Amino acid sequence: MASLIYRQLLTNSYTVDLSDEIQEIGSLLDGPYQPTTFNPPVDYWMLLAPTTPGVIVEGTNNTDRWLATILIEPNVQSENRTYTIFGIQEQLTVSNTSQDQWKFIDVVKTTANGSIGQYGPLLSSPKLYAVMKHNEKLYTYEGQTPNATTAHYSTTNYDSVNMTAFCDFYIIPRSEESKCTEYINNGLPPIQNTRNVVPLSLTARDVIHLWKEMQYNRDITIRFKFANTIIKSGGLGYKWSEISFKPANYQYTYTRDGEEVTAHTTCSVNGMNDFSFNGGYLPTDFVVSKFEVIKENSYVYIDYWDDSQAFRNVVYVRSLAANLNSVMCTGGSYNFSLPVGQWPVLTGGAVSLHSAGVTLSTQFTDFVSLNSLRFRFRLAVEEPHFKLTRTRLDRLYGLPAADPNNGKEYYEIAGRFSLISLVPSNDDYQTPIANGELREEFNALSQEIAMSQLIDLALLPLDMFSMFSGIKSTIDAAKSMATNVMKKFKKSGLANSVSTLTDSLSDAASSIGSSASAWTDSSVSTQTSTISRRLRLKEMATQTEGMNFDDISAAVLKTKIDKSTQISPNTIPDIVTEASEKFIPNRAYRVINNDDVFEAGIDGKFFAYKVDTFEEIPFDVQKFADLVTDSPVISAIIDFKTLKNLNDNYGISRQQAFNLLRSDPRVLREFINQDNPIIRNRIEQLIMQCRL
Amino acid sequence: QNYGINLPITGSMDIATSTLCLYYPTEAATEINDNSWKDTLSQLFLTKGWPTGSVYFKEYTNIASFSVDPQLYCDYNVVLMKYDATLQLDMSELADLILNEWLCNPMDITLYYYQQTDEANKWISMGSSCTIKVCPLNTQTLGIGCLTTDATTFEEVATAEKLVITDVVDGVNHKLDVTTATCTIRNCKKLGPRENVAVIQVGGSDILDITADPTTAPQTERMMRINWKKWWQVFYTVVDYVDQIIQVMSKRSRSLNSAAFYYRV
Amino acid sequence: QNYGINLPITGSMDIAYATSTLCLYYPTEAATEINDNSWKDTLSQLFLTKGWPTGSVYFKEYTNIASFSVDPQLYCDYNVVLMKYDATLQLDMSELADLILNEWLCNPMDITLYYYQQTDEANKWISMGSSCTIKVCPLNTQTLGIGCLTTDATTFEEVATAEKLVITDVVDGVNHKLDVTTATCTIRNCKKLGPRENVAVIQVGGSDILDITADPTTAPQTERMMRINWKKWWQVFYTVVDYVDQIIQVMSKRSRSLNSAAFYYRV
Amino acid sequence: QNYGINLPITGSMLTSTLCLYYPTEAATEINDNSWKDTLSQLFLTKGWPTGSVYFKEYTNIASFSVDPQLYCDYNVVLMKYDATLQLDMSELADLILNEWLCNPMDITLYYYQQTDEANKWISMGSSCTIKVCPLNTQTLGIGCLTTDATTFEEVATAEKLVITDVVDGVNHKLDVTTATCTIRNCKKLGPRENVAVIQVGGSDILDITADPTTAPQTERMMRINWKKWWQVFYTVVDYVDQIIQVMSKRSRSLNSAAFYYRV
Amino acid sequence: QNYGINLPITGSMDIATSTLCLYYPTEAATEINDNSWKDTLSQLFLTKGWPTGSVYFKEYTNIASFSVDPQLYCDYNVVLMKYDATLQLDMSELADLILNEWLCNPMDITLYYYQQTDEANKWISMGSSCTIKVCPLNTQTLGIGCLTTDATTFEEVATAEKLVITDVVDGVNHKLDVTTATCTIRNCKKLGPRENVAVIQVGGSDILDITADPTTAPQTERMMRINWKKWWQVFYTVVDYVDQIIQVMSKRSRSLNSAAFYYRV
């Protein structure tokens, strides 16, 4: 009956694994940032990702060695190249056999003004560098991709090493090492995985962030842009390497019927395509490595923030919806710069944007943390042609990452968004506009619940839907509410008990009863108490008749959950786990055999009686153990004390007594209606025991 | 415990030191042109039957000034109020303020909005200068007829006043903009009548709307009018019929400290 | 719901039987010795962890003990006030303890013309202001001077000097004539009705010194006056936080504030 | 095992040691060395065997607080009032007045929190100065930042013995000069009834419980007055009957130490 | 309730994770020649069945310095001592000091005159520089091979030893003379077997004696011996047989919840 909520709780628990898998995918990179000077603490890694040729990163000592890093593009044979190492120009020999993967080389000076060499052969397609400083040694990436090792050196002044970079770098602690390799050896990680999406000023402290419902239905006019990153490869400008999309920022103002609203927006793109226009293998010809274009399987995200009485209540969201209107984006001409001959020109390319989701987001400008709204946009391909002239590239659709600005400095999107926020209103006035003891309270609240309604609720079984359908929830946390309670429940005491019973039963396929079985394994009192404690697990075996203890436990838990208000969504799993075990330690069970009844109590009580006139019967442990193994079991809500007192002090008929031994809800509720003091005492004693 | 308000009290149909205040305006004393009038009034009250040291006299400069932090000292209060043909609203508000009991709550308008619960909630602002401007909202926190972030288009309900009583239609929240440097605004609810006070006016035309109710003006026996030309006539005629005044009111609603309203948190 | 007349109640001795606001008054010394502006939010979050609703714990500040005693504030549900012990401010400490730990129902006074007397040990003269200098001269039955010339306001004897608060008592059964400059101070005739359990006072530094009743026969160090040692105000704040529930158990809601006493004496 | 401790019991209806802690000030004022023999012989005349009374010396209350080492079964300790040392006085009295069980803390690396009203943080050392910052569920400091140390909040500076409490139930990140002190998490079990404290001048400052609303005065916290230390010694020795009737003897320490270590 | 009053027990005859510390000498640390060895051993103990981070490790500079008041703060302790062919008595003293419960009472050297009562009584002196000189006395406190006033005729029993155990014949008093500024002597009475610890010896030839009793040479099961040439083999051996080591020992009987007035230290 109402006990079914327990049985389902351990049943579908396996699904948590799937969610847990997703959680491990969701189980985080800090960056990127402007190229500046700082002191990255120990136990932190440096995940550098340059794209432009030049001096990548250097760690200054002024007393110990000089470390220099040089990045070399492919398609360059054995020649000499000039860089600016520590401000002093130096020539370096370069010889490359790989054609689509760039190569990093480490330059070491034995002192501040020592000799110059080139070593540390690194080859990588995403062009990623890892440097660590921990435990009296410096770590740097060494070994060919994908699987490699870390070169180790030991030079003084470790904690004072301040490495000035000239690219975008991420700082990661040690525990995400399994992430780091997965984020280094497996291509460029998506931008949405980052914490500080915009490459603006760096902060080392960024934090991702009775009631009353408040509704805000306002209007937005989003103006957003794109951003291109272009790099030129080696040689003499005859070929480029990367023309890609990068995040952009735009801050503007507009009118909203009087207010000069300041709207801050940031844009990003994910899942783009990379068309390859592979030229001839001769060193002097127009060759492009990757051409990043946006297609149907790619999306663009916009993060929107602006001061308003609506945006100042977003920290807790009850419901969120979007009703945007689609906006078309068309590209413009992008003429290459080929020193000799006619340079190629890109033309065409047009797409449309539509809204298919929304959630919270993080954004920072200088030092101000924001709780922004992230709108997800799906893309569609359109009519206008997109071709690359002067070559053989024709009949392609999408939008190139060369010049999507098309002269216009903003793309307008107008729509209406509606969200519902939860605000702490201790009364029906003083509503804010801008943004333990529970054990004692729960135990004290458990003295005033009614009985007839309790029995009625215990008659109606619950499920995974009715348990949380009466409690308010936040849409951000309601996603993982059943998942967390089931994850905590699969580690409950009842879980260990059922696992041990299953293991013992399976092992038995290789005492106090008639023979060996998985249930027969003041001495009489102790043995009977152990038998009852093991038999408590029978309530998960669906071999009961009528109501059971766990039904009452579930009913009282539901009632006290509904009445209580001092419990957070993070607290429900603990309460459920503790209550499913600690509730009702004094359980009683009775079994019937040929007009005879044997009953045993966990506390150490044991009795036997007949169904005709309730005559005391001497106790036989052997037959009890023989029959309880495979026979109907009924929870002894009405044990022998109450039954005998009722048969003496009140003139009941045979049907009532026989149903009471079966614990029929109808006759029990009839007795409740009659308000017999003995049944009230029994029910109240049972109820008072329900506490943590 | 609860002083025993639960168990009903049943009887039978056939069964068989004190203080008195006197509030007067200052210009009345100026027109009296005497320095020992208090002693004469004391002797007359003694001849009436009050013990010596029971009648006390207090002074208030003006209706505007007295309404700031009103105080009631004695177990009985008979205030003398002068009438101006342009201060009807202020006189009515003062009568309502120091004629009925109140339970108030403190307010801080820099963080919280405010609303109304039912038709027994009123706003009371006191101070040397209170200017209260309101701007209601729709069902989605948007100003109607007033920009919610502009302090210019807010409608006005109070300016250049010392005692202001404000009410707006319930069911809709509002934002408040007041010069809090010289004012303080509190949310109050009326619990019923105060019988510790009594108001007698000189002149006037029986115009005192003691309730915010537009429909009715329930005149009681605690608000009366007397004609005047020289203040000594009024003093004599108010000390002569004092027994009727005492019979009208009662001394069983005295507050603990002198405050027209009960503060809370 | 018969508010006025007291009616006897009836109960039993065997049958089984059986939100608000919290304020805090602290001296400026702790503020000068903490050096953290956002401490209010920290304390609010800690009280939230203890169970109190957030955004509902108020704070008040005062310059000194004597200046704080000027017109004290009962406007709160649970007064928990700290006081720095001083080896030379004992009388002001005692008078403050008397004034903010008992419910005092007072009456108005005007000494410039009238006589005054007292009838019981519950009768006291309480003066509050910025500069109060009490002069007292008892008189005989025939209104003649006893140790003072009634026609002059100099031959009297001063029972107070340069204090913001003062509590005085005279022998019941005789009349008195009072002299004080009421320009910067006022005075009331008050009767001590009953103990107000809406306030708690916790002392820091020194030893047990308070005396809540003027009777020499009793100096009851009751359980609404505590004493703790201190060298860092953060320690005092934490110690107060850790036992808010015990302080709540000691006290209770103001009995006069409940609707039960709506016609005896409102709050 | 159980002769009746916490198990059913049915009723019906000389060589013990005695230490004495004295400050150096008394010895300097009286200016003699033969007084030990005099006190031993007076004890013998009172009825206690000679050589059964120890005597130990402490330079200062601060120094004596550094890891106290009990040396007898019955104990009486003397202390002198100070103008601005009541915190140390009361804390030392409470520490040496109740039994303690302490779990060593690796304060440098991990975080900590207490569990109940019966938990306290005890720190002793030559020069201790603790600074703590409370945490949240987001692992960000409240009124503080988890990286820097200066912006923390002081709880004790340059103090020999610190007994402190925090809001019990929420984790906190602490910091201290570990190379000059030591911090241990301890729980107060019960009353250590084999030690009494005698005050010499003062006004009953001692409080033996962190509870603000409860501050009892037991039978082992008394006070006398002094003008020459010989008077105090003679009064203490003469009325040894009352003192020996007050305390018990079944609270002997299983080892010579103030508080047990991880048991 | 109350403990300590041992009520007699009555059973029947019809029935069927903590802290673990470990010490080692500095020579072992030098021979190991590694940094992360602690993590390796902790993970090995995790494999054998102990929680990670629950197996601490300490160190002692030398057998001499380890002798200066050897404390123990573990529920399970095994002490590793490196045998040396010339400090046999030092090893015996260390074993007899850390193997049995010792109940001590402080003893002076100037005022009183100490003695001994029973064979279960010993004298323990610990300090940086312990020089112990003794002299027996007669009933009349006269001189017996030494004069009380003199101090240069007292018989040495132990000089400069970091640990000193001594015993004198019962029934006679003895006077002492020892540098209190460098050594401390404590009158102690032996309670019984302290099972919280075990001793494992490397090399050696069964030298330790756990008592001054001549006629008895009790080879306890807690005293165990091995042989070694590289410390890693000994470490692996002692880690492998953790089950036998813990089964030999038991909980510190004086640290259970039966402490109340059970003559705990």
Short mmCIF file of N, CA, C and O in Angstrom, two decimals, chain A residues 214-218 257-259 309 428-433, chain B residues 105 111-115 139-142 147-149 173 187:
data_model
loop_
_atom_site.label_atom_id
_atom_site.label_comp_id
_atom_site.label_asym_id
_atom_site.label_seq_id
_atom_site.Cartn_x
_atom_site.Cartn_y
_atom_site.Cartn_z
N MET A 214 6.66 36.43 -7.31
CA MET A 214 6.60 37.73 -7.97
C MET A 214 6.80 37.53 -9.46
O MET A 214 7.73 36.82 -9.87
N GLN A 215 5.95 38.15 -10.26
CA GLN A 215 5.98 37.99 -11.71
C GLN A 215 6.52 39.25 -12.36
O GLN A 215 6.06 40.36 -12.06
N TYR A 216 7.49 39.09 -13.25
CA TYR A 216 8.06 40.18 -14.03
C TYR A 216 7.93 39.85 -15.51
O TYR A 216 8.50 38.86 -15.98
N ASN A 217 7.17 40.66 -16.24
CA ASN A 217 6.96 40.48 -17.67
C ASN A 217 7.37 41.78 -18.36
O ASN A 217 6.55 42.70 -18.50
N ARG A 218 8.62 41.86 -18.79
CA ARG A 218 9.17 43.06 -19.40
C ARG A 218 9.58 42.74 -20.84
O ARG A 218 9.32 41.65 -21.36
N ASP A 257 10.57 53.13 -22.52
CA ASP A 257 9.54 54.06 -22.04
C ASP A 257 10.07 54.91 -20.88
O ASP A 257 9.48 54.97 -19.80
N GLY A 258 11.20 55.57 -21.12
CA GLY A 258 11.72 56.53 -20.18
C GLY A 258 13.13 56.25 -19.69
O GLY A 258 13.92 57.18 -19.49
N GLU A 259 13.46 54.98 -19.50
CA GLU A 259 14.72 54.61 -18.87
C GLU A 259 15.80 54.39 -19.92
O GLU A 259 15.58 53.71 -20.93
N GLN A 309 14.15 46.29 -12.35
CA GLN A 309 13.46 45.67 -11.22
C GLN A 309 13.16 44.20 -11.47
O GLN A 309 12.90 43.46 -10.52
N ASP A 428 2.83 39.71 4.79
CA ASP A 428 2.21 40.18 3.56
C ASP A 428 2.51 41.65 3.29
O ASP A 428 1.72 42.34 2.64
N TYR A 429 3.64 42.14 3.80
CA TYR A 429 4.16 43.45 3.44
C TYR A 429 5.67 43.43 3.62
O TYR A 429 6.24 42.44 4.10
N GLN A 430 6.32 44.53 3.24
CA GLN A 430 7.78 44.63 3.22
C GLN A 430 8.38 43.52 2.34
O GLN A 430 9.12 42.65 2.80
N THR A 431 8.02 43.57 1.07
CA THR A 431 8.55 42.62 0.10
C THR A 431 9.87 43.14 -0.46
O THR A 431 9.89 44.22 -1.07
N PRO A 432 10.98 42.43 -0.28
CA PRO A 432 12.26 42.92 -0.81
C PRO A 432 12.25 42.99 -2.32
O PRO A 432 11.55 42.24 -3.01
N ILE A 433 13.04 43.93 -2.84
CA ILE A 433 13.16 44.14 -4.28
C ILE A 433 14.52 43.67 -4.79
O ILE A 433 14.61 43.17 -5.92
N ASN B 105 4.21 49.34 12.95
CA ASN B 105 5.43 48.63 12.61
C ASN B 105 6.43 49.60 12.01
O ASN B 105 6.04 50.53 11.29
N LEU B 111 15.01 49.64 1.14
CA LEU B 111 15.15 48.25 0.72
C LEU B 111 13.84 47.58 0.34
O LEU B 111 13.81 46.79 -0.61
N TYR B 112 12.75 47.88 1.04
CA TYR B 112 11.53 47.11 0.93
C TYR B 112 10.41 47.93 0.29
O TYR B 112 10.29 49.13 0.54
N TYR B 113 9.60 47.26 -0.52
CA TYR B 113 8.33 47.81 -0.95
C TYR B 113 7.31 47.69 0.18
O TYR B 113 7.58 47.12 1.24
N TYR B 114 6.12 48.24 -0.05
CA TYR B 114 5.05 48.17 0.94
C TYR B 114 3.71 48.04 0.24
O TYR B 114 3.55 48.41 -0.93
N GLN B 115 2.73 47.52 0.97
CA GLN B 115 1.40 47.28 0.43
C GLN B 115 0.38 47.47 1.55
O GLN B 115 0.68 48.02 2.61
N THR B 139 0.36 44.49 -11.96
CA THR B 139 0.57 43.15 -11.44
C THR B 139 1.93 42.57 -11.81
O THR B 139 2.19 41.40 -11.50
N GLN B 140 2.79 43.34 -12.48
CA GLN B 140 4.11 42.85 -12.87
C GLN B 140 5.18 43.90 -12.60
O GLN B 140 6.09 44.10 -13.40
N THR B 141 5.07 44.58 -11.45
CA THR B 141 6.12 45.48 -10.96
C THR B 141 6.53 46.51 -12.00
O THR B 141 7.72 46.75 -12.24
N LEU B 142 5.54 47.14 -12.63
CA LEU B 142 5.79 48.22 -13.58
C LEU B 142 4.95 49.43 -13.17
O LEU B 142 3.76 49.30 -12.91
N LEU B 147 7.41 56.68 -13.73
CA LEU B 147 8.60 55.87 -13.96
C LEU B 147 9.15 55.38 -12.63
O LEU B 147 9.38 56.17 -11.71
N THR B 148 9.37 54.07 -12.53
CA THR B 148 9.76 53.46 -11.26
C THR B 148 11.18 53.81 -10.84
O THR B 148 11.55 53.51 -9.70
N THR B 149 11.97 54.44 -11.70
CA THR B 149 13.34 54.80 -11.36
C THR B 149 13.59 56.30 -11.49
O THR B 149 14.74 56.73 -11.55
N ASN B 173 1.08 46.77 -4.44
CA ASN B 173 2.26 47.27 -3.76
C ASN B 173 2.61 48.67 -4.26
O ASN B 173 2.13 49.12 -5.31
N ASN B 187 3.91 51.86 9.56
CA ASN B 187 2.71 51.15 9.13
C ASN B 187 1.92 50.74 10.37
O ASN B 187 2.45 50.04 11.24
#
